[PDB]
Design a protein around this ligand. Sequence first.
Ligand SMILES: [Zn+2]
Length: 584
Amino acid sequence: MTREEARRRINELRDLIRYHNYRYYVLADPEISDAEYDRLLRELKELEERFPEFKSPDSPTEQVGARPLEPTFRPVRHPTRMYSLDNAFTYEEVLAFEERLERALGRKRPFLYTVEHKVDGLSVNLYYEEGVLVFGATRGDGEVGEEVTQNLLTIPTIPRRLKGVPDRLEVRGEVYMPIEAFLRLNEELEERGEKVFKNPRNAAAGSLRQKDPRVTAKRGLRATFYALGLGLEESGLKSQYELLLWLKEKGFPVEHGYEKALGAEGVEEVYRRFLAQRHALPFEADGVVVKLDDLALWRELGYTARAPRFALAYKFPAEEKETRLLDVVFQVGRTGRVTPVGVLEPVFIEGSEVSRVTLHNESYIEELDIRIGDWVLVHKAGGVIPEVLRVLKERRTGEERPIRWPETCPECGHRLVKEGKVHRCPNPLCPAKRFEAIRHYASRKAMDIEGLGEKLIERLLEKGLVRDVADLYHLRKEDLLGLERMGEKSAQNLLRQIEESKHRGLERLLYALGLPGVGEVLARNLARRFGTMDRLLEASLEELLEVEEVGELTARAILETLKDPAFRDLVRRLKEAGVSMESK
Ligand SMILES: [Zn+2]
């Protein structure tokens, strides 16, 4: 086969193989065979050896198997260089800018531009040959970036096969995480006790820089594209505006908004119409980008040491302000995690007066070394949630006090317990955990109670009919369930579930009362070994370790809950209502 051809199949093979390793270990909806699949992974290795030149530590081969095809974070120089824009913060600049362009002119100044939102994300490069996606790397330093093609496949919008494009195409855009996701990812991290991201750029970086591409897919990652590299001239594009439309038609996703505008003045118009939607977008945007619209006049205009001249970045005012951290108070979540809250000196960020800010968890406070008396620079993560961006250390009077959790839980009085990287309340009955408790217990994985809708649980909790798990069985009085959208067509029905659930066995019962670590499997492995709550309640450290997957750390934990009077109490009241305490 002609050296040229070999390249193509090599380009294609590696793709189909990345696509299907994805279509498999990721999506779980493979099309081809798990065997006919290796019938390609082999041929890839056949051409790679009879044309050694094409070997690339990117190829599926370099690390094959029946494992998730990972992305080699190997450094890669991009076909063309990727630049950064210069920053303007006032209309004077951007006037001056368009003025700088006047150096040439042609009976004007009002210059047609294309203005678009500034996607707070990470620049990515996507090289394509004959249309096929060869690789996709991060911006890195503008010249060499990390290879991360696999992860770029977890984003369904990034196209793999173009059509009618230049033999060599280098399309550039960005990959980002929407505030909802950003915020979601940040919530799951606080609970685990990890340090949370301070913004959508970083949070997008990591979510893409994961060995296991299966992870990048659960993160929200979205990508948009706005520029070409090797290919401008090839494409026949003339206007920036057309570019974005061309880019769209080809299968590339272009989601950040854009529009035309004439002369600084006009640009300055879109700017504000934008600055007003600065928090109305499904993603954080810290400014906009003024791009001269005539691509033809891009060449004459050059790039400085590290920036273009035909384009510019007009950024929104930076919302950052210094203030002091005065006191810090604690709260307890629905899971038990005792959260930290910093009470700052009343300050201002966009008119909204900030006075109470989340610490996060103990990690954040530790990482940023956030003491008390400390002066802190507070910002808005994602431009939506204020948080101490960093402490102004040098200004430390040296008399600041270190943040320490309290001995007890402020919402029930029970002594606290450090279950991992975050402090929490072991109390089985702490009022702060009722809703979560009642629900977990009601899940099909638990004592399966389909009637208890998330709304009824908080309705039964607010109206005082319930307080904990046992109370469910004393709701017998349907007279009780007949005042919250239920009649007796609806009552009697649920009433029998709170009954039938009495019969789920000790296994499922142990899982319902959420013990420290006792997972669905750790629970069953617990019921089998004790037959009854009574027995278990008399379990010993040793007896507990001896169990499959019960480690010393969790053993000594379960051991303390079990002895807790509250737990005892809750259990008794459940037995005394007919809930079976034996293995089913
Ligand atoms: Zn508590």
